[PDB]
Amino acid sequence: RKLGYAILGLGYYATRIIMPRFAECEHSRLAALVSGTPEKLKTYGEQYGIPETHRYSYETFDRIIDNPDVDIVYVITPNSLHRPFTERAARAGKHVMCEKPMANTVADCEAMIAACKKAGRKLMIGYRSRFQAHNIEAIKLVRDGALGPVRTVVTDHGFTIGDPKQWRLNRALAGGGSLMDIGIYSLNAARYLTGEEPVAVNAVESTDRSDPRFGEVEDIINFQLLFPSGATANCVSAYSVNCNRYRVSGPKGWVEIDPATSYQGQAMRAQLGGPPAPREPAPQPKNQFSAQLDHLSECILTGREPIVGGDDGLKDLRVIEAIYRAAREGRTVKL
Amino acid sequence: RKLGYAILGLGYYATRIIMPRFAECEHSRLAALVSGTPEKLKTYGEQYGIPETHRYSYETFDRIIDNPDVDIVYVITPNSLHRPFTERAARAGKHVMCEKPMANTVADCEAMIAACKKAGRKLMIGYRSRFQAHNIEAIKLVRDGALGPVRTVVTDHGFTIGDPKQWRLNRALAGGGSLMDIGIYSLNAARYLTGEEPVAVNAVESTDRSDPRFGEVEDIINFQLLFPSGATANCVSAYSVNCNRYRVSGPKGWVEIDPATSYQGQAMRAQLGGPPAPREPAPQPKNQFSAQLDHLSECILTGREPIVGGDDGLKDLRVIEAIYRAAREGRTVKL
Numbered sequence: 098r099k100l101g102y103a104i105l106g107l108g109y110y111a112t113r114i115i116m117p118r119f120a121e122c123e124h125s126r127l128a129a130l131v132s133g134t135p136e137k138l139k140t141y142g143e144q145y146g147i148p149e150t151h152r153y154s155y156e157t158f159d160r161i162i163d164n165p166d167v168d169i170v171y172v173i174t175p176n177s178l179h180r181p182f183t184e185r186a187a188r189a190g191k192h193v194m195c196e197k198p199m200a201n202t203v204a205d206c207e208a209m210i211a212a213c214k215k216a217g218r219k220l221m222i223g224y225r226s227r228f229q230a231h232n233i234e235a236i237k238l239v240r241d242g243a244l245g246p247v248r249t250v251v252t253d254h255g256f257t258i259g260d261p262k263q264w265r266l267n268r269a270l271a272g273g274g275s276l277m278d279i280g281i282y283s284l285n286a287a288r289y290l291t292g293e294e295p296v297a298v299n300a301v302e303s304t305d306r307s308d309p310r311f312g313e314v315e316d317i318i319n320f321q322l323l324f325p326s327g328a329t330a331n332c333v334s335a336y337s338v339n340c341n342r343y344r345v346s347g348p349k350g351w352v353e354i355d356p357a358t359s360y361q362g363q364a365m366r367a368q369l370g371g372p373p374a375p376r377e378p379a380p381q382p383k384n385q386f387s388a389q390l391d392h393l394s395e396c397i398l399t400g401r402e403p404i405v406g407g408d409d410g411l412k413d414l415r416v417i418e419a420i421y422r423a424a425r426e427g428r429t430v431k432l
Numbered sequence: 433r434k435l436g437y438a439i440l441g442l443g444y445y446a447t448r449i450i451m452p453r454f455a456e457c458e459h460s461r462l463a464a465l466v467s468g469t470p471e472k473l474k475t476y477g478e479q480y481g482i483p484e485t486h487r488y489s490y491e492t493f494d495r496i497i498d499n500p501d502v503d504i505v506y507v508i509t510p511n512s513l514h515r516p517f518t519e520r521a522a523r524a525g526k527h528v529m530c531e532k533p534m535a536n537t538v539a540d541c542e543a544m545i546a547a548c549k550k551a552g553r554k555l556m557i558g559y560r561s562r563f564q565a566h567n568i569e570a571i572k573l574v575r576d577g578a579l580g581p582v583r584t585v586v587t588d589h590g591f592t593i594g595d596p597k598q599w600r601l602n603r604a605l606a607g608g609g610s611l612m613d614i615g616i617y618s619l620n621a622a623r624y625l626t627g628e629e630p631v632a633v634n635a636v637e638s639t640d641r642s643d644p645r646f647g648e649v650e651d652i653i654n655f656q657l658l659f660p661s662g663a664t665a666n667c668v669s670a671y672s673v674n675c676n677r678y679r680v681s682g683p684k685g686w687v688e689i690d691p692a693t694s695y696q697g698q699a700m701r702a703q704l705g706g707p708p709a710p711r712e713p714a715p716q717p718k719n720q721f722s723a724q725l726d727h728l729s730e731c732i733l734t735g736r737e738p739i740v741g742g743d744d745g746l747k748d749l750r751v752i753e754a755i756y757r758a759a760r761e762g763r764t765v766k767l
């Protein structure tokens with residue numbers, strides 16, 4: 098049994114990364130395209146053999162309720178449009194896969210969760226690293242007690258951004274700067290490595306507002322998290338350095354991945370009561386993208402809830418609001 | 433050609449690490465011993481061929497003023513004793529090498545600097561990493577602009593401390609916990625890699641007071657630094673995990689060392705003109721310990737000021753006070 102996906106927003110991630118990976122899926126297929134660019138519907142429709150009946154503009158999208166080949170809409174647009182497209186997908190009786198960050202605010206996430214709940218449809222956020230081999234290995238080592246209690250998580254995510262005119266540098270479409278786009282990987286990782294939610298937050302922003310890229314959103318905002326167990330995290334979020342990594346440590350040892358949450362190339366090193374050494378994770382059947390896609394499909398088919406549901410995206414937005422507040426007010430924000 | 437050292441405080445660092453390294457010095461020799469343990473004066477005096485006239489107790493130490501073979505006193509005691517021995521050494525007409533952390537407070541550091549200034553003698557703090565090949569290479573890469581403007585420094589220093597009864601876990605003798613002992617390497621590195629002094633500080637402490645080790649001083653205290661250029665640092669200081677590293681990054685690339693400030697075993701990796709790769713540093717004439725020792729001697733011989741004088745130790749204690757305050761008050765402390 099395969100469930101049908103409509104991909105909405107035919108941009109870089111949708112067309113270069115997600116859509117090719119349906120080939121390795123076991124319970125998911127590409128069934129429809131939704132796009133504000135007529136030329137894209139033709140090109141990708143013809144390339145993937147999607148009939149004109151299964152091609153939608155943003156103005157014909159609501160008619161997708163009548164298409165039984167579509168079970169899931171995967172929203173892959175600029176951040177500020179996640180909420181409205183998610184609401185309309187739910188209104189058309191479809192389950193929803195929504196990219197990160199879930200939405201611009203906590204209230205927006207709550208609205209999305211409520212809309213899907215009212216429609217009796219499932220909602221999943223695209224945290225693919227939860228389906229990536231090295232990340233799974235790290236999470237399980239922590240849970241199995243290989244490190245003892247988690248004491249520190251040190252995680253850095255950033256890339257040197259370019260073109261000042263792109264939507265990520267537009268506050269109205271992005272919702273915020275590096276933290277919304279890439280720093281959220283540091284946050285999401287601190288949360289799934291500890292298996293906890295933070296109770297206190299520090300942050301510091303560093304942005305040159307005279308830079309053509311950063312008139313509206315932040316460049317660097319680094320943050321500290323304290324968790325109930327006493328676990329701590331130091332996190333980097335940046336648009337002016339390239340980094341992608343974490344190390345989680347306890348009294349019995351540590352494990353790190355660098356790059357940690359990239360499309361490919363993950364490399365893990367561990368120190369588990371002996372000398373530091375490379376560590377291969379347990380093999381996974383399918384790549385992280387195909388796994389993410391099937392996870393939602395399998396959840397629908399078996400009546401389970403996704404391991405990264407709308408509530409996971411909401412929990413990230415909760416801390417992100419606190420991070421922004423801490424950097425703005427120059428104080429520890431309690432949660 | 434060789435200035436004479438008196439080693440004061442014959443503990444682990446003095447006897448196992450420093451004393452064997454006079455072997456490779458070019459301008460420094462072991463001339464005297466100062467100890468509160470008569471047996472140690474016998475053992476090491478006989479081992480290093482130090483005449484009985486050149487052996488002192490803490491009670492007879494001030495007599496060293498009449499020993500022309502002693503030019504320098506190297507204070508290697510618990511932290512709370514750095515100030516009184518440094519002041520006595522200065523009044524005995526000796527130049528002073530003082531181990532980190534310089535002293536317990538800013539005020540203590542100021543008094544030490546004043547004492548040595550009044551005596552017309554030089555003062556140097558034992559930041560051996562400034563004479564270590566990989567560290568020198570990292571600094572040079574930053575100063576040469578290889579990374580562009582420094583944007584982030586991520587640095588973690590900690591070890592799993594053992595015996596609860598040792599002086600490092602006693603507030604009266606240590607002045608504080610992991611930050612005083614090992615976290616100061618994270619701080620000092622942030623300062624010498626940026627070449628700057630911090631203007632804002634965040635911190636979070638995490639300590640299990642039920643642990644027999646931490647009834648008096650802190651286990652984890654992680655901190656954030658903001659510098660005038662906009663450079664930032666995320667720092668870990670810990671007594672319950674093992675880490676020793678830093679990565680400094682800018683828009684053009686990054687360089688890291690792991691382990692960074694260890695006695696031996698430094699390994700550097702950099703991402704500059706291509707993907708991350710190992711990088712061997714330019715060679716240094718002698719090991720970091722002999723080089724530190726000879727640096728003070730040479731400064732005295734040539735009438736120059738040490739690259740890590742009392743003011744460098746003071747500048748660290750200034751940020752340490754702020755870090756402790758930031759953690760206690762839950763706010764960004766400005767400097």
Ligand SMILES: NC(=O)c1ccc[n+]([C@@H]2O[C@H](COP(=O)([O-])OP(=O)(O)OC[C@H]3O[C@@H](n4cnc5c(N)ncnc54)[C@H](OP(=O)(O)O)[C@@H]3O)[C@@H](O)[C@H]2O)c1
Pocket residue numbers: 105106107108109110111131132133134137173174175176178196197198223224225264270278
């Ligand atoms: N999980 C991950 O690893 C990952 C990776 C990259 C991106 N993302 C997320 O995916 C989402 C899209 O990112 P992207 O890199 O694919 O961006 P993108 O290349 O710029 O594509 C965005 C697409 O959204 C559509 N769109 C609808 N309204 C738009 C509007 N006002 N302005 C611009 N585009 C609009 C457009 O497709 P049409 O022409 O068809 O209308 C556009 O091509 C973001 O939320 C991002 O955070 C996630």
Ligand SMILES: NC(=O)c1ccc[n+]([C@@H]2O[C@H](COP(=O)([O-])OP(=O)(O)OC[C@H]3O[C@@H](n4cnc5c(N)ncnc54)[C@H](OP(=O)(O)O)[C@@H]3O)[C@@H](O)[C@H]2O)c1
Pocket residue numbers: 440441442443444445446466467468469472508509510511513531532533558559560599605613
């Ligand atoms: N730069 C570095 O890499 C490095 C490394 C390690 C330590 N250090 C610093 O060096 C200093 C000493 O550290 P350590 O590891 O050598 O400690 P240690 O092994 O315990 O030795 C400390 C010595 O100081 C003397 N001392 C005088 N009064 C004392 C008192 N109340 N309690 C305990 N000892 C007393 C003792 O020598 P006597 O028996 O001769 O009186 C004792 O053996 C510290 O400030 C530390 O931060 C620096």
